Amino acid sequence: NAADRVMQSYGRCCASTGFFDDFYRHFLASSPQIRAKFATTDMTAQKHLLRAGIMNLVMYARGMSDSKLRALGASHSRAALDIRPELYDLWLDALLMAVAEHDRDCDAETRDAWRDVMGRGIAVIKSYYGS
Numbered sequence: 001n002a003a004d005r006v007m008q009s010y011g012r013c014c015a016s017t018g019f020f021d022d023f024y025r026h027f028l029a030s031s032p033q034i035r036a037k038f039a040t041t042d043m044t045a046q047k048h049l050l051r052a053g054i055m056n057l058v059m060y061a062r063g064m065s066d067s068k069l070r071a072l073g074a075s076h077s078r079a080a081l082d083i084r085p086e087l088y089d090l091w092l093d094a095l096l097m098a099v100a101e102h103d104r105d106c107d108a109e110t111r112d113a114w115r116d117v118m119g120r121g122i123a124v125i126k127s128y129y130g131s
């Protein structure tokens with residue numbers, strides 16, 4: 001199951017120091033738009049939020065209610081944080097790089113499972129941007 005593959009990988013990632021540090025380093029480096037959005041964010045706190053957020057995307061992919069993803073859609077929409085849909089591709093690229101760096105068993109199957117599993121929830125979030 002793709003969600004199972006992602007859960008196994010994410011366990012190894014969270015067990016590896018520097019995973020979330022590296023994610024944000026890659027994500028911030030990817031565009032000045034990302035740096036501008038996070039310029040007055042407590043990045044230590046944000047890493048905890050992201051850890052839980054990725055868990056929410058996995059729970060959705062395992063069959064939980066779209067309620068939490070709808071809420072993320074609202075919070076990241078144009079009317080709130082205002083996160084343009086194009087920025088999620090940069091988020092996913094940064095995640096995949098961090099996974100490759102921190103999951104010792106990462107292979108093509110792992111990477112495709114991450115893209116598939118995260119992509120489902122990302123689609124929901126993006127769909128609310130202009131709502």
Ligand code: HEM
Pocket residue numbers: 033034037038040041042049050052053054057071072075076081083087088091121122125
């Ligand atoms: C699927 C991908 C994403 C997940 C799982 C995620 C998760 C979260 C969570 C849980 C929060 C805190 C609660 C909330 O507002 O919902 C948050 C806040 C925030 N997110 Fe995201 N997010 C994602 C994508 C993005 C992207 C692509 C950006 C682009 C820059 C972004 C920018 C922000 C900003 C600027 C905040 C507020 C930071 C602050 O000022 O303290 N997020 N995100």
